[PDB]
Symmetry: C2
Subunit: 468 residues, 2 copies
């Protein structure tokens, strides 16, 4: 009996990706594989459970799916616990994105463009919440302590953000068996495509911290391939255009960071430059192209609204399924319900590697343990690893990250430490010292005022009591 | 034959302090002690040499004093080399303070209050010059390479700022036998005085980096003494007033840093808080008292002018000496020329410890070497040490610095690394990345403009060619 528990299974698109990958993995598509879907939103949970059951049926997979509103029941004796939950106050909100939208506006009201949580080296929208990410940190630690008692052999597969902060605090403060998951490394394939390189003929590696990873190795036909990037920068960068607001991997910002640091930032790292690329929307469009990227006052509200519409549609689709047993989800909406094709993300390959010894190369957030020698052994970094039934095996990182990149990641590590200290100390003065270092802070009184108004939002009642 | 060479002996007040301490140290006041005074300013050098000779004569000390304008002659076979030189372009300026004054004004012209060199954790005036401190770094390394050849057994006793950056780069890039000197630790005695404690009955220790040191141990009558500070904060802080612009050790800023970090910052560390204490002159007066401290647009120009007047007076006093052999410098100006009393600074005790095994406890900038375990072995820190003829012996630092102070010093260490990278790479883009992290930077174009105008100052011709 293998038990795979999805905490936050109302993330039904992500739930359906995980379910579909399991159902399409021969070693896991068995009667003895039990998938537990747990969520605090009953409508979303029900709808996700109906869609997952019908989906699995159309794939002719015999896995069992169980739904529950009990965190304890989902954790009890689980082999793998995937945390994709995004907490929210149900008295005021329907999903977590809403608390971040509203605090971001408050921040902008007080002169912080894109909110206080948008800082240098961390512009990724929704990554942290009021700096210390209290509700998301709280849930992960609660899961971690429950599983130390109820599931001591389980892996906690952390996907909800902040992955860096949460994986570090869990590891450090509970010793629970937590691993952080992010597929930002998938940006490399955009590089190979733009440079007309067969991905299978490229010898490559990335390393760093979450959303702070760099293409430390890039070789082709027995030689360094970066001169091929240099040629692309000269001849083709002038004509580059993003296909959508998320398309930044080959943007002027990415190449400007590569010029200074010596290696190419990969994936969401490109979103996390200095303020040079982010002072305002016009500056974002200069460095990221027509959309200004995804982390701005136009595109992010547009996207969160798209996700809300999708949640409502999936609830309605679940009702359609109950009314029309004969309909084929894979036929009517083949995008949402793909068939005969794995998603390509790392969660199910990880599970199949640990349990069934299907060895695979992944990029995961684990303790450094001397892999990057100029960083502490206990700091959680995003590293290239091979996973099998004997656990996680860190690759040697070669070539080493450049000196300049090392003194780029150290500040991001220190920001993590200040964020953890702000959480564990319950001390509002720590949040004030974080913002006194913010370039947008003009005065100390500005810091108190913006934090005051944030804490006084009705849905931040628990946060306010935590720091009081 | 012991040879003590003062590079920059035109710092005649500092030269006279060093000369007077030697002349009043029994083990060093000998015929075989040769003091070499070297400086590029002939008038200042001559005047310093005349005053030093007459001074030594009135102390009945037989030490030999030699003046030279040759750096090589001063370094050749020296046992100790004290670097107090402050370079300047003689085509435009008469002393080094002038290049810092003029670049600071340019910075303020472009919206950087107190100049680009005034950054968080480094508000100390004149500490760095255009971030990377090119002329001061250049001289120290030139001395370091000359002495590796001409004086392989010598100690380079670095006193010119930036002490942290220069001691680190010399150690790292040349392996020369450099030790950094700063007496900021003397602030502890202000604490003992305000709290009515006999200094000899206090068990105390400080540690950190240069201008980043903290009173990690403070005990009295077999117990922690910090509760005595707490009582002083409650009953006496409201009525505290600075005696002069340099008096900040017991200021509201110092106590506000102590509240957050858990230990008291000592000496010039109190000048180096966050921008909380430094946004403008009115804010400086709130946190430092009536004068706003010494690092502001009123008090610093007032002080540099006082030093200029003093240089002119000492030149004129030297002429008086030549005209009136019978006058007694110790009688007419006993402040400048004290008798029967050591200065209390660390340079001559250090020399007497190394050469004559007079063991003494000092606070010096040396490689960590595991003393503070959460920092690299090779990073130069300001540490409590015992010095004897067997060299430098680091005390165990106990109690350890607090967690919050550790994540305060790490950013200052990283700033040092960025400053060194800006120097060695000769890359103006590095200075631009430093300022993009500055809270006062509003745009990227602002950075280029302020650096452009700084580099284009006539006296920065060498700096401009270095970075071109
Ligand atoms: N990417 C990361 O993945 C995470 C989720 O992203 P989305 O799927 O877009 O958000 P989402 O809001 O669509 O999904 C999050 C799910 O977690 C549920 N949830 C909230 N609190 C919970 C709790 N205490 N226990 C169990 N479930 C809970 C929500 O009801 C929701 O169904 C985010 O944290 C994001 O940073
Ligand atoms: N405190 C630190 O002590 C240092 C000196 O402070 P002050 O005495 O107030 O400055 P100062 O300007 O009064 O003394 C510096 C002396 O070094 C001399 N000098 C300049 N370049 C030199 C060189 N290449 N070789 C030898 N001598 C040279 C100057 O002529 C001057 O006499 C500063 O760097 C300061 O940061
Ligand atoms: Mn991610
Ligand atoms: Mn100093």
């Amino acid at each position: 009996h293998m038990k795979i528990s999805i905490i936050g299974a109302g993330s039904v698109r992500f739930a359906l990706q995980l379910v579909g990958d399991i159902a399409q993995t021969e070693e896991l598509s068995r009667e003895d594989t039990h998938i537990y879907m747990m969520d605090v939103h009953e409508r979303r949970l029900n709808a996700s459970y109906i869609l997952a059951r019908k989906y699995v049926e159309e794939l002719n997979s015999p896995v069992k799916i169980v739904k529950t509103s009990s965190l304890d029941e989902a954790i009890d004796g689980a082999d793998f616990i995937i945390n994709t939950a995004y907490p929210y106050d149900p008295r005021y909100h329907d999903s977590g994105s809403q608390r971040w939208d509203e605090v971001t506006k408050v921040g902008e009201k007080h002169g912080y463009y894109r909110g206080i949580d948008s800082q240098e080296l961390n512009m990724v929208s929704t990554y942290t919440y009021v700096l210390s990410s209290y509700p998301d940190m709280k849930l992960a630690l609660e899961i971690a302590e429950k599983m130390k008692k109820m599931a001591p052999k389980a892996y906690l597969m952390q996907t909800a953000n902040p992955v860096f902060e949460i994986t570090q605090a869990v590891r450090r403060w509970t010793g629970a068996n937590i691993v952080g998951f992010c597929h930002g490394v998938a940006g490399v394939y955009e590089v190979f495509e733009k440079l007309d390189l067969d991905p299978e003929e490229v010898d490559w590696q990335v390393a760093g911290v979450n959303h702070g990873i760099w293409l430390n190795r890039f070789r082709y036909r027995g030689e360094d391939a970066y001169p091929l990037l240099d040629e692309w920068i000269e001849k083709k960068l002038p004509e580059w255009e993003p296909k959508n607001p998320w398309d930044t991997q080959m943007s002027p910002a990415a190449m400007d960071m590569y010029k200074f640091y010596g290696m190419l930032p990969i994936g969401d790292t490109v979103r996390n430059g200095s303020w040079k690329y982010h002072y305002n929307l016009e500056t974002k469009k200069k460095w990221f192209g027509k959309f200004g990227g995804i982390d701005n006052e136009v595109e992010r509200p547009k996207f969160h609204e798209q996700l809300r519409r999708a949640r409502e549609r999936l609830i309605k689709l679940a009702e359609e399924v109950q009314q029309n047993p004969g309909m084929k989800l894979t036929e009517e909406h083949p995008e949402i319900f793909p068939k005969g094709k794995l998603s390509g993300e790392q969660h199910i390959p990880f599970i199949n590697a640990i349990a069934n010894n299907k060895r695979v190369r992944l990029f995961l957030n684990v303790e450094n343990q001397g892999t990057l020698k100029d960083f502490p052994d206990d700091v959680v970094m995003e590293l290239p690893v091979w996973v099998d039934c004997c656990g996680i095996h860190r690759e040697k990182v070669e070539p080493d990250l450049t000196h300049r990149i090392k003194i780029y990641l150290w500040p991001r590590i220190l920001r993590m430490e200040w964020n953890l200290e702000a959480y564990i100390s319950r001390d509002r003065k720590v949040l004030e010292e974080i913002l006194i270092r913010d370039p947008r802070t003009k005065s100390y009184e500005q810091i108190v005022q913006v934090l005051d108004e944030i804490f006084n939002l009705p849905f931040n009642e628990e946060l306010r009591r935590y720091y009081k």
